[PDB]
Motif scaffolding. Structure first.
Motif, PDB file in Angstrom:
ATOM      1  N   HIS A 108      -6.978   6.844   5.812  1.00 47.65           N
ATOM      2  CA  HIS A 108      -8.072   7.444   4.880  1.00 47.65           C
ATOM      3  C   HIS A 108      -8.465   8.221   5.562  1.00 47.65           C
ATOM      4  N   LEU A 161       0.687  -1.442   0.475  1.00 42.79           N
ATOM      5  CA  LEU A 161      -0.014   0.165   0.116  1.00 42.79           C
ATOM      6  C   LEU A 161       0.977   1.296  -0.087  1.00 42.79           C
ATOM      7  N   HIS A 178      -6.966  -2.782  10.045  1.00 45.16           N
ATOM      8  CA  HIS A 178      -8.021  -2.380   8.730  1.00 45.16           C
ATOM      9  C   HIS A 178      -8.612  -0.687   9.450  1.00 45.16           C
ATOM     10  N   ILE A 201       0.785   2.551  -3.754  1.00 49.26           N
ATOM     11  CA  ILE A 201      -0.786   3.084  -4.138  1.00 49.26           C
ATOM     12  C   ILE A 201      -0.980   3.747  -5.250  1.00 49.26           C
ATOM     13  N   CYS A 234      -7.081   7.901  -1.974  1.00 53.84           N
ATOM     14  CA  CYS A 234      -8.443   7.206  -1.256  1.00 53.84           C
ATOM     15  C   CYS A 234      -9.211   6.249  -2.526  1.00 53.84           C
ATOM     16  N   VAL A 286      -8.165  -1.480  -0.752  1.00 52.81           N
ATOM     17  CA  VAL A 286      -7.876  -2.753   0.851  1.00 52.81           C
ATOM     18  C   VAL A 286      -8.572  -2.556   1.494  1.00 52.81           C
ATOM     19  N   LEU A 287      -9.606  -1.644   2.294  1.00 50.95           N
ATOM     20  CA  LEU A 287     -10.467  -1.856   2.756  1.00 50.95           C
ATOM     21  C   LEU A 287     -11.662  -2.489   2.402  1.00 50.95           C
ATOM     22  N   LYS A 316     -14.006 -20.555   9.126  1.00 51.01           N
ATOM     23  CA  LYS A 316     -13.954 -21.110  10.579  1.00 51.01           C
ATOM     24  C   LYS A 316     -15.930 -21.722  10.766  1.00 51.01           C
ATOM     25  N   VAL A 362      -6.240  11.023   5.145  1.00 52.86           N
ATOM     26  CA  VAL A 362      -6.658  11.745   3.928  1.00 52.86           C
ATOM     27  C   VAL A 362      -7.618  12.852   3.374  1.00 52.86           C
ATOM     28  N   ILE A 385      -9.765  -6.441   2.819  1.00 48.92           N
ATOM     29  CA  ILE A 385     -10.072  -6.920   3.921  1.00 48.92           C
ATOM     30  C   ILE A 385     -11.079  -6.594   4.479  1.00 48.92           C
ATOM     31  N   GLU A 386     -12.182  -6.568   4.006  1.00 51.10           N
ATOM     32  CA  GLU A 386     -13.849  -7.412   4.666  1.00 51.10           C
ATOM     33  C   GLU A 386     -13.841  -8.466   3.678  1.00 51.10           C
ATOM     34  N   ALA A 419     -12.810 -16.060   6.074  1.00 48.71           N
ATOM     35  CA  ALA A 419     -12.083 -16.518   7.314  1.00 48.71           C
ATOM     36  C   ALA A 419     -12.875 -16.797   8.710  1.00 48.71           C
ATOM     37  N   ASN A 420     -14.171 -16.359   8.108  1.00 46.92           N
ATOM     38  CA  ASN A 420     -15.307 -16.766   8.775  1.00 46.92           C
ATOM     39  C   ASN A 420     -16.226 -17.296   8.316  1.00 46.92           C
ATOM     40  N   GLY A 468      -7.836   3.769  -3.594  1.00 45.80           N
ATOM     41  CA  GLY A 468      -6.300   2.809  -2.996  1.00 45.80           C
ATOM     42  C   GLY A 468      -7.345   2.040  -1.772  1.00 45.80           C
ATOM     43  N   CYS A 469      -6.969   3.192  -0.853  1.00 44.87           N
ATOM     44  CA  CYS A 469      -6.981   3.073   0.510  1.00 44.87           C
ATOM     45  C   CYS A 469      -8.801   2.206   0.595  1.00 44.87           C
ATOM     46  N   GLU A 470      -9.631   2.118  -0.016  1.00 44.24           N
ATOM     47  CA  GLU A 470     -10.963   1.808   0.471  1.00 44.24           C
ATOM     48  C   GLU A 470     -11.523   0.825  -0.496  1.00 44.24           C
ATOM     49  N   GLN A 489     -11.475 -10.751   3.096  1.00 39.58           N
ATOM     50  CA  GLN A 489     -10.734 -11.731   4.343  1.00 39.58           C
ATOM     51  C   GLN A 489     -11.422 -11.986   5.536  1.00 39.58           C
ATOM     52  N   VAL A 490     -12.221 -10.924   5.914  1.00 37.82           N
ATOM     53  CA  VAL A 490     -12.779 -11.097   7.066  1.00 37.82           C
ATOM     54  C   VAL A 490     -13.636 -12.289   6.610  1.00 37.82           C
ATOM     55  N   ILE A 534      -5.238   1.530   8.763  1.00 36.52           N
ATOM     56  CA  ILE A 534      -5.516   1.905   7.129  1.00 36.52           C
ATOM     57  C   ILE A 534      -6.966   2.899   7.185  1.00 36.52           C
ATOM     58  N   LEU A 556      -6.237  -8.636  10.933  1.00 33.40           N
ATOM     59  CA  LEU A 556      -6.449  -7.551   9.837  1.00 33.40           C
ATOM     60  C   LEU A 556      -7.624  -7.314  10.043  1.00 33.40           C
TER      61      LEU A 556
END
Ligand code: ZN
Ligand code: ZN
Ligand code: ZN
Lengths: 166, 309, 74, 288, 214, 63, 135, 60
Positions: free
Chosen positions: D204, B304, D197, B308, E172, E178-179, E193, D207, E182-183, E189-190, E174-176, E185-186, D200, D193
């Motif tokens: 964000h 990142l 999260h 980015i 912004c 990645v978020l 499980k 930003v 990550i979600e 993983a759930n 790119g950050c969104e 991935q949540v 980040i 994570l």
């Protein structure tokens, strides 16, 4: 005089003339000449040490016993100057060391070989180019070797256990 | 229920103290659960010390084979590590502290003592062993906790041990894995001796609301640079030590298995070998998950930041 | 008095030199070795040596590693 | 209204994790003992250097409810005051803390009694029933204001900070490492994570604030805020970073090393499963 | 004290102007310390110099605000002759622009873009810039490289505001992304499980059924 | 050449200029190579064991 | 970096000569000036060649290599030398420490910018609160 | 004789009132406490005489 030479021979790092010799036995004319030798021994002044040896040879190696040990004494001080000096500047040309030590190149090579074989030098010699390459060992490893040994040993262990149990 | 452990049942504690099941087994107490609060206080005090040993008392309770530490407090004593039962000099203070604690709703009583070993590991020396023996002669259910604040900082992992002594004359059974510690020359000699002498209590702990408050606040700011590299495991001392212990354990398992193939009809040997192999596998696994999580965080963050846009 | 004081530090000079890295002295175990070493010398002085191993406060400045038995000493 | 309007902080307050730790433990036990989340009351101690106040430790106080008024056992507080003297001299009393939401007409009564004791007490209130992502801790000071001709004591919010030492930092970092595991392991990578999260999300949000400020400046505001927009643009120009062959080589090196470690761990798990399968099979049909 | 001197000249520029202002600007270019010229350019009297007859100093100041040393070499006829301090300041600004893009600068690029003949004076200029807190970095002489860790920023002609907005929007987005990853991935993983729990409960049900059978 | 074949000299012979160059192989590269070989062998042995279990469960043997 | 014109003022102050009774060790001023110039070299220069280092120190390259060798031996300057290429590798923070320091500095500068906007422009703080409440 | 030793260099950095003093032997020689401590671990013969170097004083 015998004791001062004996203190030199054991590669001692302590002034033998300090207090018991005091001044009557530290500044006696011929004894004072011996004091300059051990003083050069402390400072590792190879050029000055050899100058005094040649200047007072009538009382330096005059004793046949000392004359026998001058060669070993010269070998030790040259080694100490070499070991102290070679800490930096890996990949040095041999003739530079010879000029610094004021000795022949062949003697430098022989002294370097002896030092490496004594594990005092972490490196090897390039005789083709008259070069002394020292291992800087900057990799910081020696743990991947242990990891690999563990991996192989325990995987062979698992294979043997599976073969025996099956 | 996360907060169930915080409930104090006085009658149940009295019943356990009247029953004294620890008299029936010298290995009775196997687990040590430590609250966040107690651990934090102890570490802070030890680090304020810096290179001098400090000590204190631990408040808590017992639950089956588990000793529970809820809180702790420093004792104003001299001679930690040199005086047998140094805590005794604080007797009066301990009585008043606890009395005053009871006035504000601290109901748990003395469960043990903690002290620090700055830069020399976590173990019980001859003095520590004498002290804890006396602490297990009048107050049998007592746990000795040792913390190395210096190694905690240098290793980036909490260096804490919980220990209980054996009675005079009593010999430990066959098991004793004994994780090796890098104690100094003579300190390590005495350490081997006393690791053969005592028995450690499996650190268990419990995630709670105390923990929830800490993890949240510190990570937000003290980890604004959530970077802190990403691999404090880079030091080849903890993971490498675990790897070497794993290798030794499996080598011993193979040595036992090879000799056990000649004896036909020894079920206990098979049981022990299987259990040892399983324990080794789980240890290696947990190390693997730790490494994988580290690399995952590293990859996400550095990708990142670096690329980015 | 001078020779009694001489006895009182010679036992401490001997104790911190011998139980340094010999066997084990959980309580009063290795101390018998030092009494045997000083058997031809003087009386074993058990009480004297027993309060003087803990009374190793010869450094008032201290403020450093405390005198943990013989570990701190040489 | 017990809150002062237009009053700025006069002193700087430094808070330590131990203080928040004591408040959380005090609230939990009182809730466990008496059902509902009973309000707790304690005291704050630490070091004060002029206008710089550092709260390093905190403890609990005995209080009683008489005539619907909280009466603090200052005699117990004074008995406990000399009790903490016996252990620590450098720590001085700084104020008192409590739990709850907005200030109630009972905390003013508590604060006025604490103001009777020392020259200037600090008031801290924690909210254990919060729902936002912000810290539910606020520090208030004592201010005298003339309301309707009568001097009424009010509370002014202080812009306190979060000061901690290397010790506490490393300690709570490994407390978080230990919470990453547990006896009842639900998930581990999930928490990991989620932590990334949250980080980040914080970046964000920063930003977004910067972008909104830039858009407002393009529309109105200061046409050029000087060094601020200069440094913002410079940092946006350092966003590419630019790696060299060596950095990419080292990154791939670390990735390959730890991936080989992961492969070894997977092999260990697989061989353990194989050993269990073989042990079961040797009982299923095989003899000896 | 450069900022205080910069503000004083800003206050003076609100009043006196003309040839005195141009000489004052020349003193700014000669006085060491000032590394940001954007604040000067936004003064109304600088705009008065735009419609004024004199433009050599304004084109000089404009180049220090946006141009670099090679542009100054091209304009050696339309710009007033600089001093040794003015030339060094512009060379430092040019190095800042070069260091802003690439964090590692080979010595070949340094000798080319700055009219640098002797490498010795190149080192002297580099250390002079660093010691005046302009650029933070490290010099690699074996590879003849200049590794710059940190450097000061530069000015904007209000046309780079669109580029800044685009860069912030990309960050912004790119950050969104990645978020959202990550979600996801949540969720994965759930789900894993939940699958493990389903396998465990199936095993338990099978065991209980066999127990009931016997 | 005989000593290199037997070992304990760890060298390479450069017959072009007739210069004996010592060999200092990277530990990591060899470790990764032999780890990949070990993984391949482990997969092969796992396949062998699974086949053995399949033939034993289904009672497959020459009468 | 210390050049050769600051020598005159300091030398006069020392002891109308050098502080002691003369120095004559190439002057203790210049010995420390060279020593400081090697420290200042160590702060920036990743590596350095003999001729370029000597010209920086205003001394012969043979003198520069010896004093740099002496400082490395005494531990006052980290690094190593290669005599074939004639280049002294002062310091390089591998790849990880440099990247970590750059990221930390970037985050610190971002925080400083945010604090500056909040302080110098409280109206920006109000606008940010309004925006975060709207979305 | 004073002003620290080679194993300690500076006055500060975890000295605690400089726990490194001068030690006197029965032969009336004087050295640093740490210097003879490193000497006494390898050899034990007081390199200036041939006395066994008893311990007669601590500090000066
Ligand atoms: Zn201890
Ligand atoms: Zn010392
Ligand atoms: Zn002596």
């Amino acid at each position: 005089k015998y004791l001062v030479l004996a203190n030199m021979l054991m590669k001692s790092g302590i002034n033998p003339f300090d207090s018991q010799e005091a001044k009557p036995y530290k500044n006696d004319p011929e004894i004072l000449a011996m004091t300059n030798l051990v003083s050069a021994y402390q400072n590792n002044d190879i050029t000055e040490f050899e100058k005094i040896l040649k200047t007072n040879h009538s009382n330096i190696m005059d004793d046949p016993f000392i004359r026998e040990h001058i060669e070993e004494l010269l070998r030790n001080i040259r080694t100490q100057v070499l070991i102290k000096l070679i800490k930096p500047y890996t990949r040095i040309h041999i003739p530079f060391i010879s000029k610094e030590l004021n000795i022949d190149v062949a003697d430098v090579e022989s002294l370097l070989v002896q030092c490496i074989l004594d594990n005092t030098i972490h490196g090897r010699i390039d005789q083709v180019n008259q070069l002394l390459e020292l291992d800087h060992q900057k990799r910081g490893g020696a743990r991947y070797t242990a990891l690999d040994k563990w991996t192989n040993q325990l995987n062979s262990l698992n294979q043997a256990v599976v073969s025996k149990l099956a | 229920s996360i907060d169930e452990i915080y409930k104090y049942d006085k009658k149940q504690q009295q019943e356990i103290l009247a029953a004294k099941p620890w008299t029936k087994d010298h290995h009775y107490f196997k687990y040590c659960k430590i609250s966040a609060l107690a651990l934090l206080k102890m570490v802070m005090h030890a680090r304020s010390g810096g290179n001098l040993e400090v000590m204190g008392l631990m408040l808590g309770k017992v639950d089956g084979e588990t000793m529970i530490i809820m809180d702790s407090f420093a004792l104003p004593v001299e001679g930690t590590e040199t005086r047998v039962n140094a805590q005794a000099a604080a007797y009066e203070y301990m009585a008043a502290y606890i009395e005053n604690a009871k006035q504000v709703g601290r109901l748990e009583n003395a469960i043990g003592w903690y002290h620090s070993h700055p830069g020399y590991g976590c173990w019980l020396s001859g003095i520590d062993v004498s002290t804890q023996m006396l602490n297990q002669q009048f107050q049998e259910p007592f746990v000795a906790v040792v913390i190395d604040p210096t190694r905690t900082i240098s290793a980036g992992k909490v260096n804490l041990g919980a220990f209980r002594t054996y009675p005079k004359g009593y010999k430990p059974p066959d098991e004793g894995p004994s994780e090796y510690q890098t104690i100094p020359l003579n300190k390590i000699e005495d350490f081997g001796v006393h690791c053969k002498q005592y028995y450690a209590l499996e650190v268990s702990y419990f995630k709670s609301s105390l923990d929830r408050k800490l993890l949240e606040l510190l990570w937000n700011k003290y980890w604004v640079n959530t970077l802190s590299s990403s691999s404090l495991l880079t030091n080849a001392d903890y993971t490498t030590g675990q790897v070497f212990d794993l290798s030794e354990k499996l080598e011993q398992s193979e040595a036992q298995l090879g000799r056990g193939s000649f004896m036909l009809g020894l079920e206990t040997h098979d049981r022990k070998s299987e259990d040892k192999l399983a324990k080794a596998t789980r240890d290696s696994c947990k190390t693997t998950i730790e490494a994988i999580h580290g690399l995952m965080s590293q990859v996400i963050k550095d990708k990142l930041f670096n690329q980015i846009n | 008095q001078k020779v009694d004081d001489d006895r009182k530090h010679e036992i401490e000079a001997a104790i911190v030199r011998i139980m340094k890295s010999r066997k084990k002295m959980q309580h009063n175990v290795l101390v018998a070795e030092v009494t045997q070493q000083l058997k031809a010398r003087f009386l074993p002085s058990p009480v004297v040596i027993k309060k003087r191993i803990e009374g190793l406060i010869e450094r008032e400045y201290l403020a450093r590693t405390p005198e943990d038995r013989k570990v701190y000493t040489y | 209204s017990v809150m002062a309007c237009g009053v700025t902080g006069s002193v700087s307050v430094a808070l330590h994790p131990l203080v928040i730790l004591n408040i959380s433990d005090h609230w939990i036990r009182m809730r466990s003992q008496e059902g509902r989340p009973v309000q707790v009351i304690g005291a704050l101690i630490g070091k004060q250097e002029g206008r710089n106040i550092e709260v390093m430790n905190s403890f609990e106080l005995l209080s009683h409810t008489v005539e619907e008024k909280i009466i603090i056992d200052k005699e117990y507080y004074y008995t406990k005051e000399e009790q903490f003297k016996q252990v620590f001299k450098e720590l001085e009393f700084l104020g008192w803390y409590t739990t709850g939401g907005p200030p109630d007409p009972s905390d003013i009564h508590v604060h006025k009694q604490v103001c009777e004791i020392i020259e200037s007490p600090l008031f801290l209130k924690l909210n254990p029933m919060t729902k936002h992502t912000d810290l539910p801790v606020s520090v208030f000071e004592s201010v005298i204001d003339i309301i309707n001709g009568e001097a009424t004591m009010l509370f002014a919010e202080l812009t306190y900070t979060l000061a901690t030492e290397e010790a506490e930092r490393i300690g709570v970092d490994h407390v978080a490492r230990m919470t990453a595991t547990g006896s009842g392991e639900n998930s581990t990578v999930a928490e990991h994570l989620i932590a990334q999260h949250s980080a980040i999300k914080m970046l964000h949000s920063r930003v977004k604030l910067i972008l909104e400020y830039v858009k407002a400046s393009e529309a109105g505001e200061v046409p050029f805020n000087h060094e601020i927009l200069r440094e913002a643009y410079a940092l946006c120009h350092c966003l590419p970073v630019l790696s060299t062959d060596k950095f990419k080589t080292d990154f791939y090196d670390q990735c390959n090393d730890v991936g080989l470690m992961a492969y070894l761990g997977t092999i260990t798990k697989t061989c353990n499963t194989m050993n269990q399968f073989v042990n079961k099979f040797n009982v299923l049909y095989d003899r000896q | 004290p450069s900022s205080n001197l910069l503000e004083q000249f800003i206050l003076l520029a609100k009043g006196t102007s003309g040839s005195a202002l141009t000489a004052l600007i020349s003193q700014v270019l000669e006085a060491p310390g000032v590394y940001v010229f954007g604040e000067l350019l936004e003064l109304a009297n600088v705009q008065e110099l735009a419609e004024g007859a004199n433009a050599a100093y304004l084109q000089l100041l404009n180049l220090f605000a946006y141009g670099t040393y090679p542009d100054y070499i091209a304009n050696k006829e339309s710009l007033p002759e600089l001093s040794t301090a003015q030339q060094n300041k512009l060379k430092h600004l040019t190095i800042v622009s070069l260091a802003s893009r690439m964090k590692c600068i080979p010595y070949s690029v340094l000798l080319k873009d700055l009219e640098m003949r002797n490498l010795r004076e190149l080192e002297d200029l580099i250390i002079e810039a660093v010691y005046t807190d302009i650029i933070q970095g490290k010099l690699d002489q074996r590879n003849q490289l200049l590794e710059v860790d940190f450097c000061i920023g530069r000015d904007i002609r209000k046309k780079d505001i669109n580029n800044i907005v685009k860069t912030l929007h990309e960050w912004c987005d790119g950050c969104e992304a990645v978020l959202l990853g990550i979600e996801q991935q949540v969720l994965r993983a759930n789900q894993y499980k939940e699958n493990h729990n389903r396998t465990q409960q199936q095993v338990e049900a099978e065991v209980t059924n066999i127990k009931k059978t016997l | 050449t005989q000593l290199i074949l037997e070992g304990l000299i760890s060298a390479r012979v450069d017959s072009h200029s007739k210069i004996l160059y010592a060999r200092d192989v990277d530990q990591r590269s060899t470790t990764f190579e032999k780890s990949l070989l070990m993984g391949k062998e482990f997969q092969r042995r796992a396949k062998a064991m699974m086949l053995r279990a399949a033939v034993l469960r289904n009672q497959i043997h020459v009468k | 970096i210390i050049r050769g014109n600051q020598l005159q003022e300091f030398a006069a102050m020392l002891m109308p000569h050098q502080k002691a009774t003369t120095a004559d060790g190439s002057s203790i001023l210049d010995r420390a000036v060279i020593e400081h110039n090697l420290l200042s070299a160590s702060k920036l220069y990743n590596n350095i060649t003999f001729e370029e280092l000597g010209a920086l120190l205003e001394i012969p390259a043979a003198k520069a290599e010896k004093i740099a060798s002496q400082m490395i031996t005494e531990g006052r300057m980290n690094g190593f030398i290669d005599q074939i290429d004639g280049i002294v590798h002062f310091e390089t923070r591998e790849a990880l420490p440099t990247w970590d320091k750059q990221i930390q500095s970037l985050c610190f500068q971002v925080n400083n910018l945010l604090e500056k906007i909040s302080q110098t422009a409280p109206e920006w703080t109000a606008q940010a609160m309004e925006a975060q409440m709207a979305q | 004789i004073m002003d620290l030793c080679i194993e300690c260099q500076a006055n500060q950095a975890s000295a605690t009132s400089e726990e490194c003093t001068v030690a006197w032997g029965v032969c009336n020689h004087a050295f640093h406490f740490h210097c003879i401590s490193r000497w006494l671990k390898t050899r034990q013969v007081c390199p200036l005489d041939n006395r066994e170097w008893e311990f007669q004083k601590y500090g000066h």
